[PDB]
Design a protein around this ligand. Structure first.
Ligand SMILES: [Mg+2]
Length: 284
């Protein structure tokens, strides 16, 4: 019938785990990253499958050549051994593609949020029960779709939020500094070209919610300048505004993914000196 599908924001989980586990001012090698990633996978796949989500899809961030959203906004997204991590992680990722039984959504200029947002929408409407393994609040945009639950790996609690529309509209109107998305009250590339004497005019909550409940209010409550910014930020924030060609690519990639036979896992575990994991293959 319809298999339970679990979509994992892995790039976040792996890195976040690495930041917490790998001590500062200590170099990070390939094995350290390998152990961490595979253990992270084992722990999360077991949480998913136990709940009924038996198909696992690993979603990876890939900004080797930037982001597709940058085509719309150039400013988009413009001690610890970071080099050592990214270096080893990319190598372990390629290994997961070659031996592990998971579909690894990895497209250059594509975000993990893209793969999740698109695939969640696709398989949700297709009758599958979906599980999003991530703490990211942006994925509350996807809770509106039937049979969609979200599990926070770090806090080990369910993510349940109407309030999703307000959360989404808040970033659309006020912006999202972390991604260089600016408020509609200021110029598009504000965060990238901001001088010092510059601050962003505040956005009253009453308007944020009014537009949240009825987006046609974006025409009556926003000035023409702000409305133009509003439309721009839609493509940057709202998952629904992911271009058809982008989602089309994401889907095609998924459907064209060939999984490696499970016989590969064992020989790989040994090849990587993970002998004390071959007795846990059933957990992968
Ligand atoms: Mg986003």
């Amino acid at each position: 019938y319809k298999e339970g599908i679990c979509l994992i924001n892995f790039s976040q989980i792996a890195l976040s785990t690495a930041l917490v586990n790998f001590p500062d001012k200590e170099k990070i090698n390939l094995s350290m990253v390998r152990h961490l990633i595979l253990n992270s996978i084992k722990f999360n796949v077991k949480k998913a499958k136990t709940l009924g989500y038996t198909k696992i899809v690993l979603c990876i961030d890939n900004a080797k050549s930037g982001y597709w959203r940058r085509d719309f906004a150039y400013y988009y997204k413009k001690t610890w051994d970071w080099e050592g991590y990214f270096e080893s992680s990319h190598k372990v990722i390629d290994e997961l593609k070659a031996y592990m039984p998971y579909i690894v959504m990895d497209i250059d200029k594509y975000e993990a949020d893209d793969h999740i947002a698109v695939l969640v929408k696709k398989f949700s409407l297709e009758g599958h029960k979906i599980l999003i393994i991530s703490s990211d609040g942006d994925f509350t945009q996807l809770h509106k779709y039937p049979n969609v639950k979200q599990w926070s790996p770090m806090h080990k609690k369910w993510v349940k939020i109407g309030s999703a529309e307000i959360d989404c509209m808040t970033k659309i109107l006020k912006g999202d500094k972390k991604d260089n998305v600016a408020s509609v009250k200021v110029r598009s590339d504000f965060w990238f070209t901001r001088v010092e004497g510059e601050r962003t005019p505040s956005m009253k909550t009453s308007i944020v919610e009014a537009i949240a409940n009825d987006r046609e209010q974006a025409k009556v409550l926003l000035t023409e300048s702000e409305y133009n910014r509003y439309k721009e930020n839609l493509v940057l924030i709202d998952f629904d505004y992911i271009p058809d060609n982008i989602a089309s690519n994401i889907v095609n990639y998924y459907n064209s993914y060939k999984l490696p036979p499970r016989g590969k896992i064992y020989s790989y575990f040994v090849k990587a000196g993970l002998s004390k994991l071959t007795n846990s293959i059933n957990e992968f």
